[model samples]
Target: ERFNPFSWYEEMRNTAPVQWDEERQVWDVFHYDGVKEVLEQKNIFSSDRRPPQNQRQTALGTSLINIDPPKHAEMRALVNKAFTPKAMKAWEPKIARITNELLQEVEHLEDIDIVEHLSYPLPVMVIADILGVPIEDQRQFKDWSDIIVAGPSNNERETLEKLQQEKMKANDELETYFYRIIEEKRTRPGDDIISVLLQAKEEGKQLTDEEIVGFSILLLIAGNETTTNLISNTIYCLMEDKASFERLKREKELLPSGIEEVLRYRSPVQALHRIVKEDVTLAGKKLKAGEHVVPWMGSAHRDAEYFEDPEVFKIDRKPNVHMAFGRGIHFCLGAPLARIEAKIMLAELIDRYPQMDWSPSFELKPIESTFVYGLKELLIRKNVH
Candidate 1:
């Protein structure tokens, strides 16, 4: 499953719904029902990012995704206000302006890498705006996020060990920076989510500074990373299918459906890690406490039982209930914002550059990670006038 996990996942779904991986030492849940089942049981399957006795320390205290509970519900209830329809409506003007600004940068260029020029900048700017992080300081946030996800670039044991030291250092830096912002927001709150968060209350109590910092960091990473993938991946998908591209271009109304298809066809998150809260059994397989379980959402998204002709990419697939965003309690908090962002981005792209196609100049490199499915770079060229 390392080289081409999707094809391997298809095989496993049909065969082993829940199979033990001898090499990885975790149970792989590959079927649609299997994935949803695991996700739905929040109490049984915990969402904590840190495992018991793990060597690495969490960058921030428990954020929404890192907790399970009454605590989770409380966190969600407080933060949910930031993404409500009213809030998202307020963000549209800014989101559109940012989209146009990114597009304008690459507008004159006949050839450009969409990832670097457009996809990468758009969401980071939006997220920086959301978190009230200074736009100029985004490079630092991006650097810290890269270290958190990719770990040490060097593979040597001594080098990697030293890198963990760097990880803790960066973590402390970000936490300190966020603490400063949190304190400022307390006195001079703005319309930004950070300010809203500083003012948010659960059970008549304000969120701790640690919790606010944790939430902000989570927003930095989870906020833009996947949205960047969605934008790039959706464009890649349409360009590959010339008919779909032409059709979408002809029908601007189809952007929303097209975005949904992109999410299902190529979900940004491939798998999510969950820990077992107690001894349990799943898919007739035995499970235990303190165990690592990987639910492959990508595999489940393509299960034929749930979706008809799941292999094909249909731009206007109806009844598309894909788990591009997770289901149940841990569903993505920024789902509305993500959908709106992609919809506007794709719509603008279709209108501005009707014939944009993949550039043959550069070799495409798929992002090498088990957690996310996307490309590192996607070069495209428009017809020169």
Candidate 2:
């Protein structure tokens, strides 16, 4: 079932700590320590998606994610200012308002699909306002992001080539659009991320137009995709695991930990890819230089060695050092925003419908992806008095 791929992951963890896929030509790391080894060994393994130099340089640009240390540090430092607790705090009232607004629209219904009504729209609206996209143009950016968040490759050369062409076109259009937005910020900067990026400087250097554009695109996709899945996955967890739902409802204080548990249980980002910089030995196996390693963060989150009764959905999972936001310096920057959004969404959902139930007749349709986990839609029902 799409809902539970844990069986396959369990089998892999016990048997194959590292399994090579001939088709994709990448090693899949399943165990906890093994995945940690790959992620922590930043020097041995690389964040550079390209093999040697900058093949992907044009595609990814100098965004925070596609680069390595020192430079990554520079880019990250600039972006961090925008995500500070002080900065993100201003948006909480707005975030709660958005949640209540979404709830208000759907509260009158007997049958409501949470993903459609709430999860999907919430992140896009929040991010749109932050990114400074014109309100009317916000919806277009979501359509653009949906295209960018697809598989990196396909079977037929034409199909793969088509997607690459579409991605480039999409990136180009977004680039052109943001350049205009960013340039205008030079004269009249606002309290938004684009303004922050345009003015942010490091070591007596400011981000270039290209860098600003790259950062803008990165924020749009990363901010939207992960947060959207996070909220949906939170509700899905409660629906599938009723005791967790009831327990959380009773002990409202557990909402934060419950969000963490959901992150560990159904991770938003499933796997992260790294290219080997030099030959390295890991978990008794040697990986050659130039080989690719996909650290399955989702699998690592469920490994019993790290989390007790990893299979069970405990709302108050203690010391949950799950790598859902990832490890090391490259941890997700938008994590703070995503967590706050989930906290608000969950608080509102539980307050509105204490006796909510997933539609038994609705066959869950998960998004078709190996890199991220989320539902295509989630249907729930409650008596709307």
Q: What C-alpha lDDT do the candidate models reach, one value each?
A: 0.83, 0.84
Q: Indicate the worst ten consecutive residues by lDDT in candidate 1.
A: 50-59
TM-score of each: 0.92, 0.92
Q: What is the per-residue lDDT of model 1 for residues 146-222, given as tens digits with 9 covering 90 to 100?
A: 67655466678998998878777778888998998888888988888888877777679677787778887788678
RMSD, one per candidate, in order: 2.3, 2.7
Evaluated at residue 65, the lDDT of candidate 2 is 85
For candidate 2, lDDT tens digit of each residue in 295-329?
99899988998999999989898979888888887
RMSD of 2: 2.7
Compute the lDDT of residue 240 as modeled in candidate 2: 83
